[PDB]
């Protein structure tokens, strides 16, 4: 219970309001891997995805701490698709490999 309810609600809002939400950082190899998969490989429209660079926001550490409380993950990339917690790049690639990611992205690509 490290973070304010204000921050928890704000992060929950970002998760709910955006088709895809990706918590990221600048110069983050695995963040780059996940975004390259989404935008370049799978051609998800960039305008449908909210990407935040935590290290460059005042509220950055606060947002990261909120995500830890919400989903138990402490690292970036931290991905949500259609309100559902995906995880990091490992998780995204695993869903891709089974064919699940295709079905998760379908309603969004429409």
Curated annotation (Swiss-Prot):
NCBIfam families: GRX_euk (TIGR02180)
Superkingdom of origin organism: Eukaryota
Chain residue numbers at which the record places covalent cross-link Glycyl lysine isopeptide (Lys-Gly) (interchain with G-Cter in ubiquitin): 12
Name under which the protein is recorded: Glutaredoxin-1
Binding site for glutathione: 25-30, 64, 76, 89-90
Tagged with keyword Nucleus: yes
Other remarks in the entry: Present with 3030 molecules/cell in log phase SD medium.
InterPro entries linked to this entry: GLR_AS, Glutaredoxin, Glutaredoxin_euk/vir, Glutaredoxin_subgr, Thioredoxin-like_sf
Gene: GRX1
Listed result of changing residue 31 to S: Leads to increased oxidoreductase activity
Protein family according to the UniProt entry: Belongs to the glutaredoxin family.
E.C. code: 1.11.1.9, 2.5.1.18
Residues modified to S-glutathionyl cysteine: 28
Keyword set includes DNA damage: no
């Amino acid at each position: 219970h490290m973070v304010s309810q204000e921050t928890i609600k704000h992060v929950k809002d970002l998760i709910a309001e955006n088709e895809i939400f990706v918590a990221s950082k600048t110069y983050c190899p695995y963040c780059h891997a996940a975004l390259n998969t989404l935008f370049e490989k799978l051609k998800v429209p960039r305008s449908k995805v909210l990407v935040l660079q935590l290290n460059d926001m005042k509220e950055g550490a606060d947002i990261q701490a909120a995500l830890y409380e919400i989903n138990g993950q402490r690292t970036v990339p931290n991905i949500y698709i259609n309100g559902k917690h995906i995880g990091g790049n490992d998780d995204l690639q695993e869903l891709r490999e089974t064919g699940e990611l295709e079905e998760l992205l379908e309603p969004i690509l429409a």
